[PDB]
Design a protein around this motif. Structure first.
Motif, short mmCIF file in Angstrom:
data_model
loop_
_atom_site.label_atom_id
_atom_site.label_comp_id
_atom_site.label_asym_id
_atom_site.label_seq_id
_atom_site.Cartn_x
_atom_site.Cartn_y
_atom_site.Cartn_z
N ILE A 90 0.82 -1.21 0.00
CA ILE A 90 0.00 0.00 0.00
C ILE A 90 0.86 1.27 0.00
CG2 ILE A 90 -0.23 0.22 2.52
CD1 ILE A 90 -2.83 0.94 -0.28
N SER A 91 2.09 1.16 0.50
CA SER A 91 2.97 2.32 0.61
C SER A 91 3.45 2.83 -0.74
CB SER A 91 4.17 1.99 1.50
OG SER A 91 5.00 1.01 0.90
N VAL A 92 3.34 2.01 -1.78
CA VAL A 92 3.77 2.43 -3.11
C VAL A 92 2.59 2.66 -4.05
CG1 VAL A 92 5.94 1.18 -2.88
CG2 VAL A 92 4.01 0.10 -4.06
N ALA A 93 1.38 2.63 -3.50
CA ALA A 93 0.19 2.93 -4.29
C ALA A 93 0.20 4.40 -4.70
CB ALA A 93 -1.07 2.61 -3.50
N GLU A 94 -0.28 4.68 -5.90
CA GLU A 94 -0.30 6.05 -6.41
C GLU A 94 -1.69 6.65 -6.31
N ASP A 95 -1.78 7.97 -6.51
CA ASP A 95 -3.06 8.66 -6.45
C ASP A 95 -4.05 8.10 -7.48
OD1 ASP A 95 -3.75 10.48 -4.49
OD2 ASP A 95 -2.51 12.08 -5.33
N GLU A 140 -16.48 4.92 -3.77
CA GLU A 140 -15.24 4.18 -4.00
C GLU A 140 -13.99 5.05 -3.96
OE1 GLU A 140 -15.05 1.75 -7.45
OE2 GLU A 140 -16.22 0.11 -6.60
N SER A 141 -14.00 6.15 -4.70
CA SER A 141 -12.85 7.05 -4.76
C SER A 141 -12.55 7.65 -3.39
CB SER A 141 -13.09 8.16 -5.78
OG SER A 141 -14.23 8.94 -5.44
N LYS A 198 -1.53 6.21 3.97
CA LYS A 198 -0.18 5.81 3.68
C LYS A 198 0.81 6.98 3.57
CE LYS A 198 0.73 6.25 -0.88
NZ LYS A 198 1.99 6.73 -1.49
N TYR A 221 3.23 -0.63 8.99
CA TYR A 221 2.06 -0.26 9.77
C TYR A 221 0.88 -1.15 9.41
CZ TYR A 221 1.73 2.39 5.42
OH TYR A 221 1.75 2.77 4.10
N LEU A 276 -8.45 1.00 -5.08
CA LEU A 276 -8.34 0.65 -3.67
C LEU A 276 -9.70 0.70 -2.99
CD1 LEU A 276 -5.06 2.54 -2.73
CD2 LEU A 276 -5.35 0.07 -3.08
N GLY A 277 -10.48 1.73 -3.31
CA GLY A 277 -11.82 1.84 -2.78
C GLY A 277 -12.70 0.71 -3.28
N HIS A 278 -12.44 0.27 -4.51
CA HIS A 278 -13.18 -0.84 -5.10
C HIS A 278 -12.97 -2.13 -4.30
CE1 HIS A 278 -15.37 -2.95 -8.21
NE2 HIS A 278 -14.37 -3.80 -8.38
N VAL A 299 -8.59 -5.35 7.25
CA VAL A 299 -7.19 -5.11 7.59
C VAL A 299 -6.29 -5.05 6.35
CG1 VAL A 299 -5.18 -5.93 8.89
CG2 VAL A 299 -7.47 -6.34 9.79
N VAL A 300 -5.42 -4.04 6.31
CA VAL A 300 -4.33 -4.02 5.33
C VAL A 300 -3.00 -3.95 6.07
CG1 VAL A 300 -3.24 -2.80 3.42
CG2 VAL A 300 -5.74 -2.88 3.59
N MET A 332 -12.52 -2.31 -1.13
CA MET A 332 -13.33 -2.19 0.06
C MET A 332 -14.82 -2.40 -0.18
SD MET A 332 -11.47 0.87 2.10
CE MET A 332 -12.62 0.74 3.47
N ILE A 333 -15.30 -1.88 -1.28
CA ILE A 333 -16.70 -2.07 -1.63
C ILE A 333 -16.99 -3.53 -1.96
CG2 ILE A 333 -18.48 -1.56 -3.35
CD1 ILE A 333 -18.11 0.60 -1.28
N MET A 350 -3.41 -1.04 8.73
CA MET A 350 -4.65 -0.29 8.54
C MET A 350 -5.83 -1.15 8.94
SD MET A 350 -3.87 1.53 4.88
CE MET A 350 -3.06 3.13 4.83
N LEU A 388 -13.28 6.32 -0.37
CA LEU A 388 -12.72 5.28 0.49
C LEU A 388 -11.26 5.01 0.14
CD1 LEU A 388 -15.74 2.82 0.58
CD2 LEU A 388 -14.96 4.34 2.40
N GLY A 389 -10.96 4.97 -1.15
CA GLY A 389 -9.60 4.79 -1.61
C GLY A 389 -8.72 5.96 -1.21
N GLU A 391 -6.54 5.30 -6.54
CA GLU A 391 -7.53 5.67 -5.53
C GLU A 391 -8.85 4.91 -5.65
OE1 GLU A 391 -10.13 9.68 -5.94
OE2 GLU A 391 -8.45 9.86 -4.55
N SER A 392 -9.43 4.90 -6.85
CA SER A 392 -10.71 4.24 -7.07
C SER A 392 -10.58 2.72 -6.97
CB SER A 392 -11.28 4.62 -8.44
OG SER A 392 -11.70 5.97 -8.45
#
Ligand SMILES: Nc1ncnc2c1ncn2[C@@H]1O[C@H](COP(=O)(O)O)[C@@H](O)[C@H]1O
Lengths: 114, 115
Positions: free
Chosen positions: A51-56, B60-61, B71, B83, A62-64, A85-86, A66-67, B85, B63-64, A59-60
């Motif tokens: 997750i530390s190397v994820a880019e902007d 979605e966006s 991070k 760490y 990563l949220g996907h 948990v991540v 979770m959904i 989350m 939450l992401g 965003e969608s």
């Protein structure tokens, strides 16, 4: 494609896993070492190592995760709740360097979370 | 009201104090009042969503974005060894504040299982 980890092999269907859900950009499957009566993972098909190397731009996506995680939890009957948990790095206890979202339920989750 | 009725809504509107790490138009990051690790903070949306189980598809966006901010804050706080989350949902998750939020814990070895 999918990366050089065991999760990459799972994405490519080279080794078996109990798959809960799949679409064009992610995969949900039961963890091989469950820590709760229900314990599954949601992973992106894009190989993001951590997750530390994820880019902007991620965003969608990563949220996907979770959904999809929320929806799978409902489908698996986790109506009393769950924990997501991540893990990142050594201190986070990350076991595979392919981003993955844990979803655990079916029992009382405790505090602290590890 | 912008931010909702919970104590997190009051934090968002600066009505009760918080130790804020980061703030933009979509979210807020602040330290947990009862830390479970040497570093322990929360990332919350400014839009009130009660819990992850009722989040909508077009959330979605947002939450992401919580994760990306999580991070980035972790890096800025020097959590170079890693760490964890966490999102707590409902009773079995141990949720106590019903405004969606992401825990970020670090500064020590985290153990398995995660509770
Ligand atoms: N006023 C506050 N400022 C900062 N953190 C808080 C405050 N009130 C509660 N918390 C934290 O918010 C979290 C809520 O629990 P949970 O819903 O299980 O994540 C706990 O870690 C609390 O310590």
């Amino acid at each position: 494609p999918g990366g050089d980890t065991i999760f990459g092999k799972i994405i490519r269907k080279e080794i078996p896993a109990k798959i809960i859900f799949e679409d064009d950009r992610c995969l949900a499957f039961h963890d091989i070492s469950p820590q709760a009566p229900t314990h599954f993972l949601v992973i992106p098909k894009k190989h993001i190592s951590q997750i530390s190397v994820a880019e902007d731009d991620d965003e969608s996506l990563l949220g996907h995760l979770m959904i999809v995680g929320k929806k799978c939890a409902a489908d698996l009957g986790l109506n009393k709740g769950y924990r997501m948990v991540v893990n990142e790095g050594s201190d986070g206890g990350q076991s595979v360097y392919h981003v993955h979202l844990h979803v655990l339920g079916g029992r009382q989750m405790h505090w602290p979370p590890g």
